[PDB]
Amino acid sequence: VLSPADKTNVKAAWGKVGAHAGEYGAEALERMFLSFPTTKTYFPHFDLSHGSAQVKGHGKKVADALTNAVAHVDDMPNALSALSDLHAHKLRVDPVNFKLLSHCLLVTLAAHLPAEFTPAVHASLDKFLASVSTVLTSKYR
Amino acid sequence: VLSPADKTNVKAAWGKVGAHAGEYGAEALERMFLSFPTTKTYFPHFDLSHGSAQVKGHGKKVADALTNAVAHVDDMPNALSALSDLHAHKLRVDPVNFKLLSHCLLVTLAAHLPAEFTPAVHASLDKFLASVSTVLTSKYR
Amino acid sequence: MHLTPEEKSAVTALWGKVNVDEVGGEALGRLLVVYPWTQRFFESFGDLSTPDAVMGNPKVKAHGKKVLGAFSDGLAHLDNLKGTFATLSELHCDKLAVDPENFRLLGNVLVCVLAHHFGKEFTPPVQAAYQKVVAGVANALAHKYH
Amino acid sequence: MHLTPEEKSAVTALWGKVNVDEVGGEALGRLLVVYPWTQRFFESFGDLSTPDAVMGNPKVKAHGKKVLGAFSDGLAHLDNLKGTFATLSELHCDKLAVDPENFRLLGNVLVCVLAHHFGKEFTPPVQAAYQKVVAGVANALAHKYH
Numbered sequence A, B: 001v002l003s004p005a006d007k008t009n010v011k012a013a014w015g016k017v018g019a020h021a022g023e024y025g026a027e028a029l030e031r032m033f034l035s036f037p038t039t040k041t042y043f044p045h046f047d048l049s050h051g052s053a054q055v056k057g058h059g060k061k062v063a064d065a066l067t068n069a070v071a072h073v074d075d076m077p078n079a080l081s082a083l084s085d086l087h088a089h090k091l092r093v094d095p096v097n098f099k100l101l102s103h104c105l106l107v108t109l110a111a112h113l114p115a116e117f118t119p120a121v122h123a124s125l126d127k128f129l130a131s132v133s134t135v136l137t138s139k140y141r
Numbered sequence C, D: 001m002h003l004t005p006e007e008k009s010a011v012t013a014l015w016g017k018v019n020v021d022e023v024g025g026e027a028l029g030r031l032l033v034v035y036p037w038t039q040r041f042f043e044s045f046g047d048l049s050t051p052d053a054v055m056g057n058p059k060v061k062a063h064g065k066k067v068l069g070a071f072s073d074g075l076a077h078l079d080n081l082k083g084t085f086a087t088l089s090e091l092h093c094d095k096l097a098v099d100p101e102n103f104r105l106l107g108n109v110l111v112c113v114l115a116h117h118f119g120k121e122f123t124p125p126v127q128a129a130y131q132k133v134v135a136g137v138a139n140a141l142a143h144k145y146h
């Protein structure tokens, strides 16, 4: 579980993200597809080319859900509850792929936030993402 | 999440193992050391030859703990708390190995309980062993 | 495959005793029961709503045999799994879009199904080699992904 | 190690810029802070109670310097990693007893640190190249375990 400071850090790191979320989600998804290509099996419909506008908007939707999960950091299970079914009953993305997208997300915020990506905040953000993943993966079976 | 029929399953399956949870734990471990030599790194103080006395007892301790687990399927966390503190702050076993120990307990169970091991009892034991696993690694960081 | 002659030899001997129509059927089923999210790739089989349905659906039972018979090809090409499963890799990646992680799940269920058939006979030294083997067939199927 | 020539030159290109004394020091400590359970292996480094104490710990600094060194030397033999790390693998297994899963975690923290120093320079394609490399090194360090 996230701690007071875990939350304080998370809220501060996503604070500076601001109106770059979409842009960050973008990259992150993009970092994911190039590095772990197996992840491309869920996006066969997509145009996964560099700069694809289809990635850009997916990017947005993903970073919005994260933004919102921070705004409910004390009630993530029921705030993401809807996104949880989706991934378990319609999409059905294997749970390993989550740990990969978190990784690419960290890497990203790390490239844009040199001032605030401190050890303490890296660790906090890692716990955060692990928690979002757990909720989204919680109703698989 | 354990469904009330997953609970009925674990209970029955494990009810058959009865007086053999020990015999069985010691086997699960052996196979784990054999099939996954990395797991040996947590037992440098042990003698992992075939039929070890150390590898025996440990098997009974491990199995004994699952016994208390089943009896408390409703409140695993509290029952396993002291076990989760121990693996958390002292032993500190990387969470991946739980998937290996878990897989090995199944293989074992199957080879011993040809009839109880339906695809349904199978699906529940897995879910159940992973719920033990989550609980023993929920206080790492 | 870093396989040992004493290993290879255990893998082989136990395999020669396998009823492939049964085991293949049985392995694919459980995959769909224990890792229900894998049902994603087999919507066109019919009712997969319950354990007994999945194990009962013959489209399952049938695909299972096809799958295990190919594992069977790989078990005589152990020194070159990669070459054997290339066409299969490209297929599952270029046409069927299957996430290689499902391959691993199949091994572990596989190994599981096998402990169940041969009970006592499925000793730890034997499991270890199959573990070695089913990971090999996985990487083999995952290796042409792009 | 499917390292293509371009993948191979972007990694060497980037690596030329690294201040190895420093980065090794950060990754090792970061590893130690994002995954506290890996302190168990360095209980002789003294105080590791807070982020500051770890990052500023000279024994930690001294040690990450040493680890990158082996890693620097590893990127000068992209084609015989396995033999480059044979002695270090035996050691991490037979004397130190280190679960090889830690090697992976280190790999990722490293990737996270390199991005942290190069910002937009750490482009997608470059990280992809690096992700193959640390896995490559993670695996060469694991091969002598037994």
Ligand code: HEM
Residues within 6 Å of the ligand: A039, A042, A043, A058, A061, A062, A065, A066, A083, A086, A087, A091, A093, A097, A098, A099, A101, A132, A133
């Ligand atoms: C924290 C991690 C993730 C979050 C927050 C997240 C969130 C979302 C959101 C908000 C949507 C859009 C749903 C809608 O339009 O109603 C979505 C869809 C989707 N996600 Fe996830 N997701 C995550 C991880 C993953 C990963 C690991 C995968 C697999 C690699 C994945 C694959 C997909 C796919 C294939 C869609 C459907 C897109 C479409 O059909 O347009 N997601 N996710």
Ligand code: HEM
Residues within 6 Å of the ligand: B039, B042, B043, B045, B061, B062, B065, B066, B083, B086, B091, B093, B097, B098, B101, B102, B132, B133, B136
């Ligand atoms: C279902 C998962 C597991 C359960 C229920 C379990 C249970 C236990 C129990 C009851 C003990 C004894 C507590 C005591 O010593 O009083 C123990 C200790 C220990 N466990 Fe686990 N364990 C599990 C998984 C693991 C795995 C995955 C590892 C690492 C591969 C591991 C390594 C150890 C070690 C090294 C000890 C102490 C060894 C010693 O006595 O010297 N355990 N565990």
Ligand code: HEM
Residues within 6 Å of the ligand: C038, C041, C042, C066, C067, C068, C070, C071, C088, C092, C096, C098, C102, C103, C106, C137, C141
């Ligand atoms: C050892 C592991 C596996 C092997 C050897 C294997 C092999 C095969 C083979 C031989 C076919 C026949 C297609 C042809 O020859 O034209 C096939 C098709 C297929 N496989 Fe795999 N497979 C494996 C695992 C998986 C699993 C894990 C998945 C996902 C759950 C999967 C999904 C599919 C799908 C969706 C088809 C298409 C069948 C159809 O069009 O009716 N496979 N596979």
Ligand code: HEM
Residues within 6 Å of the ligand: D038, D041, D042, D066, D067, D068, D070, D071, D088, D091, D092, D096, D098, D102, D103, D104, D106, D137, D141
């Ligand atoms: C990039 C991967 C890694 C490389 C290249 C590496 C390399 C090294 C080297 C060169 C040494 C010096 C050996 C000696 O003292 O004679 C060393 C020592 C050591 N290494 Fe690793 N290491 C890596 C990752 C890890 C990590 C992840 C761990 C555990 C978290 C670890 C555990 C140790 C330990 C416990 C020592 C001995 C500490 C002491 O001086 O008393 N290594 N490592």
